[PDB]
Write a protein that binds this ligand. Structure first.
Ligand SMILES: O=C(O)[C@H]1CCN(c2ccccc2)[C@H]1COc1ccccc1
Length: 135
């Protein structure tokens, strides 16, 4: 029972980051958390079981885990410890993750590009790009 989401499954390691501190500033992350989070080189583990997608991040800073069904809102605790309401959908092969909290919104898009999993994080006008490779 293969699914298009299968392109994302596996274990991935962070290899590059751009503009992440500015993105975190826009989200409202405090100085100390930005410094320590920005140093992290997470592994991201993506798995699928039936309709349930699991994305785990493991790092020296924090471990995070979400499980979800596409299009079905859920409660998430982010790496910076926001309590958010999240909805993840697939739009043309791109995983689109919207997080809402305190009247704010940010969108995280995840796409396969060559042998990379590219993660684009947008808050207001500020974009950060984080590139992962297979571990
Ligand atoms: O997936 C990514 O790279 C982005 C996605 C957004 N996000 C983030 C957003 C606001 C504040 C901190 C991180 C990253 C998650 O990164 C980590 C880093 C360490 C441990 C777990 C996850």
């Amino acid at each position: 029972g293969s699914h298009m989401c299968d392109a994302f499954v596996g274990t991935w390691k962070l290899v590059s980051s751009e503009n992440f501190d500015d993105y975190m500033k826009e989200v409202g992350v405090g100085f100390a958390t930005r410094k320590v989070a920005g140093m992290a080189k997470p592994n991201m583990i993506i798995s699928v079981n039936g309709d349930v997608i699991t994305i785990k991040s493991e790092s020296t800073f924090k471990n995070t885990e979400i499980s979800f069904i596409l299009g079905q809102e859920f409660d998430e605790v982010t790496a910076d410890d926001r309590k958010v309401k999240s909805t993840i959908t697939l739009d043309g092969g791109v995983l689109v993750h919207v997080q809402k909290w305190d009247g704010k919104s940010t969108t995280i898009k995840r796409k396969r590009e060559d042998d990379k999993l590219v993660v684009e994080c947008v808050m207001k006008g500020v974009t950060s790009t984080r590139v992962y490779e297979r571990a």
